[PDB]
Structure formats: C-alpha cells, structure tokens
Design an enzyme around this catalytic site. Sequence first.
Site, short mmCIF file in Angstrom:
data_model
loop_
_atom_site.label_atom_id
_atom_site.label_comp_id
_atom_site.label_asym_id
_atom_site.label_seq_id
_atom_site.Cartn_x
_atom_site.Cartn_y
_atom_site.Cartn_z
N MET A 115 10.45 5.22 1.06
CA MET A 115 9.27 5.31 1.91
C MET A 115 8.19 4.38 1.39
O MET A 115 7.91 4.36 0.18
CB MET A 115 8.75 6.75 1.96
CG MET A 115 9.70 7.74 2.59
SD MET A 115 9.09 9.43 2.55
CE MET A 115 10.29 10.26 3.59
N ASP A 116 7.60 3.60 2.29
CA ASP A 116 6.49 2.72 1.96
C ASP A 116 5.18 3.47 2.19
O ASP A 116 5.14 4.69 2.33
CB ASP A 116 6.57 1.43 2.76
CG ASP A 116 6.50 1.66 4.26
OD1 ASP A 116 5.42 2.03 4.75
OD2 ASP A 116 7.52 1.44 4.94
#
Lengths: 78, 155, 93, 506, 49, 137, 183, 80, 192, 105
Positions: free
Chosen positions: C39-40
């Site tokens: 996840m960014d």
Amino acid sequence: PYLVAFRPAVLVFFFIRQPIGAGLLAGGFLFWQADRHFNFGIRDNIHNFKQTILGFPTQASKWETFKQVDAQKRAQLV
Amino acid sequence: MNLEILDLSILGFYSLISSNSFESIAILVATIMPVITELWYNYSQLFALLYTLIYVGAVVILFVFILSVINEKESGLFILILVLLLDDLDDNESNDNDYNNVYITDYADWFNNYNESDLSVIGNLLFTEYALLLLIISFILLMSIIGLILIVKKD
Amino acid sequence: ASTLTKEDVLTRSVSVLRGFEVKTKDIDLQTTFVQDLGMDSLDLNDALVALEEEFDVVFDDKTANEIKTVGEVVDFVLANYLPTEQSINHTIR
Amino acid sequence: MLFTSLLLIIVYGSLVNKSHLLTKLINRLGLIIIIYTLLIHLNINTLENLSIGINMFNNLLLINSFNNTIIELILIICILYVLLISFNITGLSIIDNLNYSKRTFIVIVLFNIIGLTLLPLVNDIMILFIIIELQSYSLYLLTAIFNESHNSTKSALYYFIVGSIASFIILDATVSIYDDLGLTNIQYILMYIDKLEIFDLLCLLFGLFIKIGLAPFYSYSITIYSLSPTIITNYISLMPKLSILTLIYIIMHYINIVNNTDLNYVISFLILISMFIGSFGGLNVIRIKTLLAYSSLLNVSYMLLAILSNSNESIIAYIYYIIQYSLTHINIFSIILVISIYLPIMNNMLNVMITKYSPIEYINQLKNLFINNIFIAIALCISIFSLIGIPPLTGFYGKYLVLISGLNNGYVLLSIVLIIASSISTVYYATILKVLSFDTLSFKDIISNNLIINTSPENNNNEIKPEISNVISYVISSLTLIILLIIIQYENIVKGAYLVLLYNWV
Amino acid sequence: PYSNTRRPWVLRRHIIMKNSPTKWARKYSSRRDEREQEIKDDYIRGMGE
Amino acid sequence: MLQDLFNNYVILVGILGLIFLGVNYFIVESPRMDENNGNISDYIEKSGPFECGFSSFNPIPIAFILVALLFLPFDLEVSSMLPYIVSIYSVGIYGLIIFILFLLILIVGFIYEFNTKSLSITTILHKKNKALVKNLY
Amino acid sequence: SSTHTNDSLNSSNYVDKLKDTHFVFENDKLPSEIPDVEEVGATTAPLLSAAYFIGAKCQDYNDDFMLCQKEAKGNGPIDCLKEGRRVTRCASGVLKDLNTHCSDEFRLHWQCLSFSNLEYKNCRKAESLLNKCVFEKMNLVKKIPGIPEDRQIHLKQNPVLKPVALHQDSEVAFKKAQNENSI
Amino acid sequence: MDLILLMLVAVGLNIIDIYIMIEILIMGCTVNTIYSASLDNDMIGLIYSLIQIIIAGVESAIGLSILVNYNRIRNSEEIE
Amino acid sequence: METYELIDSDPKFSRVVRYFRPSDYLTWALGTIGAPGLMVLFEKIEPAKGNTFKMPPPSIMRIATTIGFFGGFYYAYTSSTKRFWGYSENAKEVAKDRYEVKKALSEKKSPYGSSLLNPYQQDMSARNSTNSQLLLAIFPWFNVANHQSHGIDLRKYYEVRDGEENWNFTLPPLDQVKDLDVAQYKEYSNYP
Amino acid sequence: APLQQVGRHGGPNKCFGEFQRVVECMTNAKHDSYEPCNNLKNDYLECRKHKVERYKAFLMQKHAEELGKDPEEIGAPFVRKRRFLTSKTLGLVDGDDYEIGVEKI
Ligand SMILES: CCCCCCCCCCCCCCCCCC(=O)OC[C@H](COP(=O)(O)OCCN)OC(=O)CCCCCCCCCCCCCCCCC
Ligand SMILES: CCCCCCCCCCCCCCCCCC(=O)OC[C@H](COP(=O)(O)OCCN)OC(=O)CCCCCCCCCCCCCCCCC
Ligand SMILES: CCCCCCCCCCCCCCCCCC(=O)OC[C@H](COP(=O)(O)OCCN)OC(=O)CCCCCCCCCCCCCCCCC
Ligand SMILES: CCCCCCCCCCCC(=O)OC[C@H](COP(=O)(O)OCC[N+](C)(C)C)OC(=O)CCCCCCCCCCC
C-alpha cells in the site's frame, strides 16, 4: 370548562391522526355507555365477580345475611 | 353518556405510546384539563380555577421552559388495546356497594344570613385560626428562593 | 467502560482489511502495511481511516508518518478507546 | 432564636464579599446561634413540667418529655457537626477549602434544624405534611450544595425523586384518614382510633420508612451515601433518622392502643428483612462509606425492634440507643475526616481516582494507621468495637436494652435473628480493624515520606507543631472516652431514661 | 335534589392518578369493608333482641 | 348562579374552533389549480424550514433559567394572598398583621436575590482589558 | 357565594348530569294531628321590601321561635312547630295589611327592587314614600339596631352610593308627593 | 389490573417523565381531598387542599432546579 | 416539683418585659456581649487562618452583637415567663400582679384591657400564643393581644391576703367591670 | 381546641353538632372509660357518610322486588331534568307543561 371547548378539537384530531385506533377506543367507549343505558348487566356482573373472589362483602351476601337474620327472628317469636 | 370517560380513555392510550418528552408534557396538560373541568362542574368551582392559575400558570409553562433546555432526540396495537380493555373492566375505586349506588340529599337552612364565598372562610381561618400553617409555608417559600439560587448559580 | 480487548480489535480488523486490495489474505499482528500489503500513501490512508470508522478512534498527525505495522494499530485502539457520553435519559432512569 | 437569627444570617450572608475567611467566620456564627438555642430551650423546657404534654399553637404542635429530649439531642449533635465546618479538620488548605467555599452551607443546616426539631412535635396532619417537607427539602438542597461536583448533584436528583415518592405516600395516607373521619388533629383522631382503618397509619409509616432507608427501600440510601462527599454524608445519614424514628415511635404509640396483630406482622416482616440485608450486605464491599451505610441500616433495624415492641422498656431502650449511636456515628465520621492526611502519594496500578470531596473512600486506605497515629486508631477501634457490641462499651447496653424490650413483648424470632445479624455483621467490622493494625509489625520498619501531611512546610523545626487541629482532636477524644468509660455513669444515666415519659403517668 | 357522592371520574380512571398505597387498599382489600359491614349488619340484629 | 348561558358560550367557541380548521380545507384551490407541481408533502422545497434562503445545520444562560425557576416561588406567594382578598374585613387587624409577616418573610427572599445579582444575565465570557506595561531590562 | 351543594339547584344542567341529580317530589301532607297553617305566599321582592315591617309587627314572635330552637337542644324542627305557626301567621298579617292599606306604595317599592337588583341603596325614593305611609296607618317604624338613631343609612340625605339608573315611577311618585304632601 | 403495576408502562423513559408522574400522583391526593372537603361541607379540608397545591408547587421548582443544574453539568465544559 | 402560684398562664408581652427582675437584664446584658466574646474566644481556641491569634473583622463583631441581642432577650423573656406560669419563684411577682389587678378592678376597668378583637378572635389569639415560649428557642411568637383566656379565677383577687389590707381597695362585683365575659352579654347572647 | 367541620359560611356544618358531643363525652371527668361514648362516635360517622342509612335503602329496594312491588307505585315521583320542572308538574292550577326558564336568572 376548558375541556368542553377543547373536546371538539381533540376528537377530530384523534380520528385523523390514528383512524383505526380511534374507531376502537371511541367504539369501546360507546359500548359501556350503551351498556349502562340498556341495563345489560355486564359491568355489574364483572364487578360482582371481583367482589366474590377477593372476599369483599358482595350484594348477594348481604341479602343472604338479611335472610338469615330474618329467618332467625321470625322463629324467635314462635 | 358521560363524555368524561372517553377523554380519559384517550389519555390512557397516548400515555402508553408516549415516546419523547413532547408526549409526556402533553400528558400533564391532558391530565390537568379533565381535573379542572370535572371540578368546575360537580364538586368545587373555586379550586377548578385555583388549579389553572397555579398548575398551568406557574408549573406547566415552567415544565416546557426547562424541557427546551434538556434534549430533543429521535408490542403493537392489539396489545395496547387489550391492556386498556381489561384495565377498563373495573372502575369503582371504592367497594362499599351501598355507599355507591344509593343517592342522598341535604336540607338547606336559613340560619347563615351572612352568606360568604368559600374563599372568605378559608381566609378567615388560614389567616387567624391556622396562622402557623401560613407562616411556615412562607418560610418554606423562603427556603426555596435561597435554595433554587444555590443549586443553579455557578458562582 | 472500554469493552474492547486485543483479540476483539484483531478479529474485526481483518474484515476491514479483507475489504481492500491486499497482496496476501494472511494478516496478523506481525504483518506490515506498506510492505506486506503493498500500500502506498493514498491506499494506506483509506484503510487507516476505515479503522477509524469502525473502532471509533482518531489517529493524530504525530503517528501519521510513524505507522509501519498492523499490530500497532490494534494495540493503539485499546489505549485510545472510550464510550461516548450518554445523555441524562440513557444513563439514569 | 433560630428564626430570628437565620434571617439575619441570610441577609448578612450576601452583603459581605465571598471570601473563605468571611464564610468560615459566618459559619462560626451558625455555631453560636445553635448554642444559644440549646440554652434557651433548656432554660424553658424541663422534664418535670412536660410529663403531661403541653399543646402549642392551636393544638398544631404537642410537646412532652419524650419529644423534648430528642430536640435536645438533635441540637447537641448539630453543635458537634458544625465544629466540622466552623473549625479546621485537617489543616491543609487543599482538603479543607471544600468546607469554606459554599456560604449557604450553614444557612441550609439551620433550615434543616428548624425542620428537624419540629417534626417529632407534629399533632395535626396538616402540619405533618408541611413539616416533613421543610425537613425533606433541606436534605435535597444539602445534598446538592456542591454543584460543581458530578456525583453530589446526581445524589440529590436521586434523593429528590425517592423522597418525593415518600412524601406522596405520606400525603396519601393523611388524605385517606381525613376521608374516613373528616378530622385533622391527631388528638381528635385518637377518639376514633377504633373506627378508622388502622392500615392507613401503616401506609403513613411506609412513607416514613422510605425516608430513613429501611429494606426493601434500602437501595437508594446506600447509593446516595456512597456518592455524596464525606462532609455531607455525615449529616444526611444520621439527622433524618433522629427526627423520624421519634415520629415513628409516637405513631406506633397511638397504634398500639388497638394492638392490631396484623400490623405487627407486616412491620416485623420489614424488620426481619432489614437485618438480613444490613448484615449480609456489607460482607462484600470495598468502600468505607458503603460499609457505614450498611451499618446504619442494621442499627436502624435494631432500633425499630424496640419501637415495634413499644412498652415501658422500649422508651428506656430507644432513648439510650438513639443517643449512643449518634455520638458513635459522629465519632467515626470525625475520625475518617481527619485520617485523610496520611494517604500515600504516587511517584500506575488500577488507575484509582480519588477526588477532593471524598479523600477516604476505600477501606484499604486505612492501612498502617496503628503506625501513623496509634492514639487515633485506638479511638477508631473503640468506636468500631462499640458497634460490634463489645461490653462494657456504649454499644453493648444498646443491644442489651433492645433485647429486653424485644423479648418482653414476645419478639422471640426477631430477637434471635437480631443476634445472628449481630454476629454476621461482626465480620465486616473486624475487616476495618484488620486493615488498621494486622500488618503493624511487618511494616514497623518502613521508609515513607510520601504522606499527604508531609507536604506542609517545616515552620521552625524546634517548636512542637501538632499534626491535627485543636478542636477536632478534642471532640474525638471526648467522644472516645464516653464510649469506653460509660460503665461508671450507666446506672445514673439509665435512671435518667426512667424519667422520660410518653403518656405513662401511672 | 337527590344525587350521588362518588369520586370524580378522573380520580378513578386515570392510568396513573388512581394508583396509591391507600387507593389499592380501598379497591382490592376487604379489610376495610369487613369491619364496616358489621356496623350495617348490627342495625338489623339489634331490633328484635 | 345559573351558568347555562355560559355553557352554551363554551360549546359555541369549541364548535367555532373546528370552523377555523375546516374552512381552509374547503375554500383553498386544489394543488392542480395553481401550478400542480406537487402536494404539500411532496413539495419538500416549500415544506421546509426557512433560514433567510441559505441552508444551515436553546442553551440559555443561567440567569434566564434562574428567572424562570424563581417565578414558581413568587407566583405561589401572590396566588396564596387570594384568601386575604375576600376576607380582608372579617379577619380584622389580626389578619393584617399576619399578612404583613407573610410578606416580610418573603421580602428576605426578595432581599437575598437582590444582593447576589442572580437575575442579571451577566457578561463574563468577554469584555476584558489590560494595561500595557513596559518591561525594561 | 355560589358553591355547588346537595340541597338546592346548582349552576348548570351539566352539574346535575355529573351528579345524576334527581329532583324528588313528596305527595303526602303533614299528618292530621299536626294543625294546618297557610304558608306565606310572597316572593323575594315583596319580602325584601317588607322585611323590616315584618320585624316590627312580629318582633315578639320571631324571638320566641328562635329562642325555642335554642331551648330544644338540637330537636328544633319537632319541638318548635307550634311556635313556627305563630311567626307565619304574624308575617301573613303584615303582607295582608300592606295590601289593603299601603298597596300603592308597596308595589312601587318592591317593583323598584326588582328593577335594581334587590339592592336597598337603589330604591331610596320609593322607600321614603312607603315608610311615611306605613307610619300613618300601621305605626310601624323601620329601625336598624346597634347604631344611633341619626346614623341609620336610609335617613342619610346625601348617600355616597346612588343607583346608576333612576327608576321612573319612583321619580314620578316622589315628585307627585314632593309638592302635594310635602308643601 | 393495577396489582400488575401497569402504571409503570405509562411512564416515560426520561428523568423529566418521572417528575411528571409524581405531580400527577400528588394531584390525585388533592382531588380526593376536595372530594372529601366538599361533601362534608368542611372548609378545613379545603385549607389542606390549598396547602397541598402550594407545597407541591415548591417541590416542582426544587426538582427542576436540580435537574437543570444536573443537565448543565454534562455540558459544563465551557472552553470558549 | 417546685410549683408556685399561677399568676398568668398566658402572660402578655408588655407584662413579661415589665416584670424583668434586675438579674434578667443582666442575663440580657451578658448575652448581648457574650456573642462577640464567644467569637473572640473561638479564635483563641483555634484561629480561622494561620496559626496565630487574629481578631475577627469589625463587621463580624457587629452582626454577632445583633445575634446576641436578639438571642439574649429570649433568655430574659423565658426567665420572666416561668415566673408567670408558676415554674419559678414568683413571690415578688405575685405581689405586683395582685396590686395591678386589684387596681384595675377598683377603677372599674378590666384586668386584661380593652381589645380590638371580637370575642372569637380573642379566643383564637389565646390558642396561638399560649405556651408558645416552649418553642421560643425554635421560632418566636408572643401574646400581644388583650384577650381573656388566662386560665384564672378572678375571685382569687377579691380575698385579701397578708400585707394587702393597707392598699384600701374597694372592688365591685364582676358583673360591672368593663370588658369582661360576665359583663358583656346583657342584650343578645350572641353578641358582646 | 381547634375547629373541625366548618361549613362554607364560617359556622358549624351539618355534622359538627354530632362531633362536639363526642368531644364532650370523651373529655368529661365522670366517665371511668370510653365505653359510654361508643354510640356517640357511631352517630358522627353516620352523619358524614350515612352508610347505615344507605344500607337500609338497599334492603328496601331489594325487598320491594321479592313481593312483586313496582317502584312506580311505592317510590317517590321525581323529575330528572331541571328545565322540565314544569308548572303543571309543580301543581300550579293554571300551569302548563312548557319548559321553565333556567337559562339566566
Ligand atoms: C375481573 C376481575 C378483575 C380483578 C382485578 C385484579 C385481578 C387479580 C390480580 C391478581 C390478584 C392477586 C391479589 C388478590 C387480591 C389481594 C389479596 C387479597 O386481598 O385477598 C384475596 C385472596 C383471598 O382472600 P380471602 O381468603 O378470600 O379473604 C377473605 C377474608 N374474609 O388472597 C389470595 O389468597 C391471593 C393469593 C396471594 C398469595 C400469593 C401471591 C403473593 C406472593 C407473590 C407476591 C408478588 C411479589 C410481592 C412481594 C411483596 C414486596 C415486598
Ligand atoms: C385543543 C385540542 C388540540 C388537540 C391537539 C392534539 C390532538 C391529539 C390528541 C391528543 C390529546 C389526547 C390526550 C393525550 C395528550 C397528548 C399526548 C400525545 O401523545 O399526543 C399525540 C399527538 C398526536 O400525534 P400522534 O401521531 O397521534 O402520536 C405519535 C406522535 N409521534 O402529538 C402530540 O404530541 C401533540 C402535539 C401538540 C401538543 C399540544 C399540547 C397538547 C394538547 C393540549 C390541549 C389538549 C387538552 C387535552 C384534550 C384531550 C383530553 C383527553
Ligand atoms: C455446628 C454449629 C455450626 C453453626 C452454623 C451451622 C449452620 C451453617 C450453615 C452452612 C450450610 C450452608 C453453607 C455451605 C453450603 C454451600 C452454599 C453455597 O456455596 O451456595 C450453594 C448454592 C449455589 O451453588 P454455588 O454458588 O455453585 O456454590 C458451590 C459451593 N460448593 O447457593 C445456595 O444454595 C444459597 C442458598 C440461598 C441462600 C438462602 C439464605 C437464607 C438464610 C440462610 C441463613 C442466613 C441467616 C438468616 C438469619 C440471619 C439474617 C436475618
Ligand atoms: C475558666 C472555665 C472555662 C474553661 C474553658 C472552656 C473553653 C476553653 C477555652 C480556653 C482557651 C483555649 O482554648 O486556649 C487554647 C488552648 C491551647 O491550644 P493548643 O491545643 O495548645 O493549641 C496551641 C496553642 N498555643 C499556640 C498557645 C500553644 O486550648 C485549650 O485549652 C483546649 C481545651 C479544650 C476545651 C476544654 C473545654 C471542654 C468543655 C466540655 C463541656 C462539654
């Protein structure tokens, strides 16, 4: 005297707001009012049932009490 | 056909279905009015007025005063009807059958040539015969005036 | 009182995490967020806000750049869980 | 004397500025007002001339040698009570500034004292329903005196609601008696004691039972007492019982004219249950005020056994019991208000929150009192031992005299139960004594400068600075020796109880 | 004029106003009536003697 | 004496109340007549609150709440002087002296509220000022 | 005053409905051994007009009837019936006398009282005519006991409280006798 | 059907609703007193009723004063 | 019991104050200055603030005197009342009361005095104030009216006791004294 | 001693006279006990409620049924409406059944 003026308004608003409920409570009210008008003897006998079960002096018991006193005194003369 | 009974039957219904504080306040007024009216006829006209001037005129509009500062948030029908119909079967708060179903009368007398209102007699007794009751009640009202401030006034 | 325990947070945390695109469906305390789930910034914020909507606990700006694992969030809720004040009607009657 | 000066204090209270020094000195003027009332009352009222009973104020109030004594008792307990707010209890400003912030504290007390004294004297239902309200309202106002607190306000709201229900029950019974007879004065009603419905006087007592917290209505009294500040609970848990147990006794005196057997059974059912709940209730509790609240219920249970029996030995038993339990209740709550200065300070576990309103709240906060102040602990132990009933303390004769009146009238079951509940209760009075001393030697070698008392600066380090105030320490010392040394004057004091009369005469 | 002497309808038919410790005794307890029935009965027992 | 005429008046006003309710339900033109755009229930735009045009989303002070609470005592005082009005003569001087006492006790209540300034709305949340002072070092 | 009682007609028919009031007649008469008497048949206005003249003529008989009540010790209605007829017969005497001697002045007075709410202050002019005519035919003088003679209210020349509306017949009869009798 | 405590259903579920029920209950005792005073033709009973109305009035004020202070307590933060 | 002669079961306010013995004023004197003293002594027993003696504010010394004044009066008022009821020594007072009552009867005036109250209100004002001193500690009430329910037999003022023959009083029979029950109902038994 | 049973005009009501004789009987010094005043107390309660008298009316109503007697021929004639106290019913010789005026005195 304020309810006599306010009674016409609330009865109208009782049928408009809750028509099905109004037709029963008002309908049930008319039953007992009719019942006392026509001497149906229902509410009287619903009442006499409670006085019998709860040990109260019922209307029939007093008249039975009078008969016992009446029957005793009459034979006392003889 | 006593129409007083119907009104109480209605009030005996909205009391069971009352949901928010609007309904409960309206129960108080809808209890006072059958009290006031049935006293205006029948028993005592003086106290039918003394209810309105004090109950409605002092407390009930103070009920709705505080209620606006409190909050305003948010079986079926056959059970409520069944509860009322069984509750309505017996309505004789007394059980003296002779005292209920036999009527009486009183005989008027002309001795009281000094006719006066029932309030004049109450004043003639509350201010002379039972002055202590009046002076204690004043003392109680004094306590409330000092009592109400200390509870609410933060400082 | 605070009725949440560590397991209760952990059990319900996965269901929210099962509701978002996660590289692996195996998530526990040791599982990370940026590494394991890939996840960014924007992806991770939605899950973190989502846990705020279920656990009803607000995450501050200090912890924003200091979150690295999912066990920390589960343990954080316990330290920061309170029941909302109930009005005078609910409490005493 | 009360009415004349209460109005003076009310006007003078708001005229001067709001400062804790002016408020405290105004509180002392409250003490002087009460002291004068006692001298004026004792001067004009005697036991010899009040034996018959003297009607007052259009027969609204009737005073006899029995109600007269309780009035003297009520005033004396209030004098000791006002010493708690008119003088320093601890000395440290942090805990004593709670008693000086509210100016109308003493004014409300004087409102309640007028209500307290007149309640036993009521002789008409019209004035009964009024006087009970003058006292009842003064309790609700008192419980809410600290309006910043959240617990004290919620106590008064809970107190107001139950007390209003009790007032309505009392009001309804008097209206029912009025409807049957058409009369108001109690002496007029006594003529028709054989023809009114006797249970309507029981419905009247059920209202008075609620106000003193008798089972099954005990629930609210324990909750209220455990929540109000210790300075407040000392007054609302004792005074209402002084002025209502006397009224209950007078009504019970009237009811025993007919000697209704059914009425005794119903009241005995409440007495029996109260001893059960008052004994088993306090076994599993952690709060000291909750424990003393259960102790109050049990000692109210014992007294009501004497009231129900209602013979010539009941007067001797009830008069002695009400005096001794009042001093002991003052003694314990005086000690608990002073031993708050030995509390430890952190420098956590269980996150226990202690507020300035009730610094001593749990029983385990009395630990090592034998070490910190041994003389105080012995006073506390003696007070606790009296409630247990260890002879020859004042408590022992209280149970000895109640059992004499209880057994004299045939209350064999309740007497045996009263003893069992006396044994069960001993468990949770010994717990207080276990906390104080049982760990003394394991903690004899302790390093502890972390007490609250250690915060005060050292003034001179040469002059001897006593840890406690002069007045509050002297009251504890005076009451402690009265309980322990009552054996000397017991025969004379009981003779003083023989002379108290309630229409005994001959 | 001959009339009745019953309590107001609102007193004996409100769902709340009719409930009190003494009103329940009037309505559901025979203890008041059993005593007050004896006086009525004595009126007829004390005639012939 | 004899209030049958008053009774009919009370009935008439009650009946007249319904006429105020009902006359509108009959005189007004039906929704289809003016614009037909919608019923009152359906026309949410019209059947909504007014806030000067722009849509938006009573914690009254202590004094306002305190004035209302103090109305209850003082109103019971005034409404309890009714017995003295109809009996001012017969009670004579004795009632008059009692009556003045019944007020002097209540005057102390009036005096007490006067001194504490309990009625004033008060302005403490704002209107604070200070004097600038140089702090030379 | 006007409080609902159980002895006489109450305010409205609704009051009678709530109480289920029955107005009951008795068809019997007094038992034969009780002697018969003719009841006074005057209504309110004639009696209020003649209340003081009935008092003067029947003063010894009013007192005996009321004294008999006190000496009956609560048994008045049975132990003072013989005295009760004396008061009725004397009262009928005055009404009959006022009808055959001062008939004109009598009707002028109580018709004024019916016109002005039965208040004695509203019919002074019709009363001064009646008092003068009665004193010249029956020797009966109106007197109000307790105060001096010169302080009785009906002799006040300038009463503070006068009727709002003047009776026309009272003014006409006063002026008719203003010049004729009172030259 | 009162021995089943039916009136508790008719009470509302707020503290303000409890206050109303008490005043209704106290009003029941006054209507009974006026019933007793009028039938007996007694003005002593009507004095009692006047006192009940006045006394029950004060109790209403003290109850709402406590409730208002209690309600203010929750919203007593006053940070701004 | 230490009973004495019952002078007046309901002594009047003006007569109670009149019969104050010199000791009674001294009691009132002590109470009026005792209250300021007790406030001072309390500071001696324990100061309100600090650990050192500090005289209370002059404002408090003024209110305390007022409390003592209205407090010390009642101790005098109660002390004098017990002499009327017969609970306290009243040899000095009996001499004074009998002289005044005899003087009242001799001058054909009522012992009690003229009243503004009709016969009922005199009876009513008797019941309200009689024995009110037994509650004088709790709240004040005084007998300020000239009623007649003093619970005595006026013939006890007719016979001459020791040391009274010198006053040379002549007393008419009771049926000729103004403002008395026996000498008021001469025309109507309902009205005075 | 305080007044009880004061009528609406300030004087004794119907049942005060029976109340005074109870007080006089009880407080009298000649009575060893309160046994003599038992009938006096029974009369006072009779005055207020008429319960014994109402019982005697219940029997008479009940007994009139068992013999077949009809209340029309034994009862007291009554009029139930206050506007129909007609002059014909009142017995006036010339009276007619028209409604009487009760609208306003
Ligand atoms: C159409 C009719 C409508 C009627 C409306 C009411 C319907 C009935 C509702 C339930 C009724 C139960 C109560 C009955 C009335 C109260 C008891 C009573 O008054 O006595 C009646 C009955 C028998 O009495 P009896 O022996 O006949 O007396 C004659 C004396 N000459 O006494 C009895 O024996 C009844 C049995 C009661 C004993 C068992 C129940 C008590 C134990 C549970 C109580 C509940 C918990 C309460 C706890 C108290 C709190 C401390
Ligand atoms: C002049 C008469 C006007 C009557 C207007 C209301 C008529 C409806 C019937 C109410 C009267 C019955 C007695 C009970 C008191 C009211 C309690 C109540 O619940 O009212 C309900 C009312 C109607 O709403 P509804 O849909 O029926 O109930 C659910 C609402 N969510 O919703 C409400 O909360 C009422 C909103 C208005 C409140 C105004 C104050 C109450 C009325 C006071 C005057 C009426 C006096 C009582 C008259 C009847 C007496 C039995
Ligand atoms: C030789 C001389 C000796 C002197 C003493 C002799 C008598 C001692 C009596 C002790 C006998 C019982 C005590 C031991 C039995 C164990 C009771 C118990 O633990 O509860 C059991 C039961 C629920 O089971 P559970 O909670 O799982 O407990 C399992 C424990 N093994 O829970 C229950 O069954 C509890 C039963 C309900 C409680 C009823 C209480 C009624 C009153 C009991 C007496 C109390 C005193 C009453 C009078 C004084 C107060 C008024
Ligand atoms: C003459 C006859 C009357 C007797 C006196 C009665 C009142 C006492 C006032 C004396 C002055 C005072 O209190 O002075 C203060 C002293 C000493 O104070 P301390 O504790 O050392 O504080 C430190 C003071 N330094 C700094 C001066 C050292 O306190 C006492 O003495 C306390 C005695 C308690 C009161 C005893 C009376 C009990 C009566 C019981 C009735 C029921």
